[PDB]
């Protein structure tokens, strides 16, 4: 089995920076992952994006610092070759 | 880095044959293996990714199999366009691995055994003025590729003073040609009388020697 | 997806090579595993190294470590290879290759560039000397005649027979690199032995880098 763990703050702060933790298990091959803040609900616009590497060197964990500046919700998206996972996040101004 | 061993290095096949090419890794890489085709003068082309998945555009006759250390490329009904060199590559990214290519497997057109017709050329008087003598031996239209050329200067075996060059498989009769150049100085050339090219080949029961005397040029 | 190599050609021994690879049809949403692959004349494929376009994570072959640096650009989508202290051994066709990003599950090289020839040599541009290849005597049977195209830099040399009229039985061999650093090429033709009395054979040698056009009549001495 190959599983992933995505960690994020509950409500996204508009203006302030947020840390998004990605952890992967069951992988021995090194690969890249993209963590992005995208529009709700069609993902037509991307606000902030961060590419992270996952390998044996960093123990298959990484994070990206992402922010949103001036809408009720955004999408947090984590994409790679092996998985694609999105979560709807509420925002406060 | 990981080592990728390909066997065989070359194989002879005809149109319609089933061709089997093996790739062996020094350690386990699960399904992370790719197969490539390369024609002379052209860039390599991906055929199989993930050990067993054929790329779109690539004909269904190409199929990959195997997991772990041993891998197999099968071409079911061999076509004229399929004659090329084939490479395996580990695709597993990591510090302990590296994306190493295998040595390669040349798929050559099988035909009947043909003996080489051997020709020897003395150096011209134009070249001797500059101070160097090139003696050329020609092996014309032979099959298969494996042929040994031995230079003899006054019945003495030569080593380290000759360069060989082989053509690609011919477009019409599927034969190879070989050119060997023996390089000597003018002073060393004038010392000796007899210059011989000795050829051994599968299509010859006895060696073919073509020779010339220097004074008779 | 298209990959274009640039920065190839003649490199002096000891100097540092720098090659650029521009990628078209790359999406910003995905990261790409972009590799450099080299091939020496008459040899197999050798993986030099690779980089992820997203994170910038670098991977290299053990022989390439200490000599090779692979760098990236985000907006330009250009991947640059740097190889320090170049040697005649490093003479190869250098390919830029890439995966298909997050769309395909493996790091296989889906896309390949046309490749750029890198020649590491200290030799200067020199026109070839053309010498006839003929037996001692003319000698019913099979006869062979040719031309030895010796001591030229750089490649390539094009050889035709009788102003392009003769094509049958012509074998123009690949060049050999001599210890001097100059190239030597042989071109031969099989001919009917009876025609040797009246029919003449002349090889036409063109070398564009030095702008030399040499025609040479081939006949046996006796």
Residue numbers in the entry:
A (entry chain E): 20 to 89, 99 to 121
B (entry chain A): 1 to 217
C (entry chain B): 2 to 140, 143 to 225
Anything the authors wrote about it?
The complement system plays a crucial role in the innate immune response. The activation of all pathways eventually converges on the formation of the C5 convertase, which cleaves C5 to its effector subunits, C5a and C5b. Using crystal structure analysis, we report that pH-dependent interaction between SKY59 and C5 is conferred by histidine residues on C5 as well as those on SKY59.
Further analysis using truncated mutants of C5 β-chain indicated that SKY59 bound to MG1 domain (20–124) of human C5 (data not shown). The diffraction intensity data up to 2.11 Å resolution were obtained, and the crystallographic data statistics are shown in Supplementary Table 1. The crystal structure of the SKY59 Fab and MG1 domain complex revealed that the three amino acids, E48, D51, and K109, of MG1 domain are located within 3.5 Å from SKY59 Fab. To confirm this, we generated human C5 point mutants, in which either E48, D51, or K109 was substituted to alanine. By Biacore analysis, all three mutations resulted in a drastic loss of affinity, demonstrating that these amino acid residues are critically involved in the antibody-antigen interaction. The crystal structure analysis also revealed that three histidine residues on human C5, H70, H72, and H110, were involved in the interaction with SKY59 Fab. The H110Y mutation resulted in a slightly slower dissociation rate while the H70Y mutation exhibited almost three-fold slower dissociation rate at pH 5.8 compared to C5 WT. From the crystal structure, we surmise that protonation of these histidine residues at low pH (i) breaks a hydrogen bond between H70 and T53 in MG1 and (ii) induces repulsion between H110 in MG1 and H-CDR3_H100c, resulting in conformational changes that contribute to the pH-dependent antibody-antigen interaction. H72 fills the space in this pocket tightly and makes a hydrogen bond with H-CDR2_Y58.
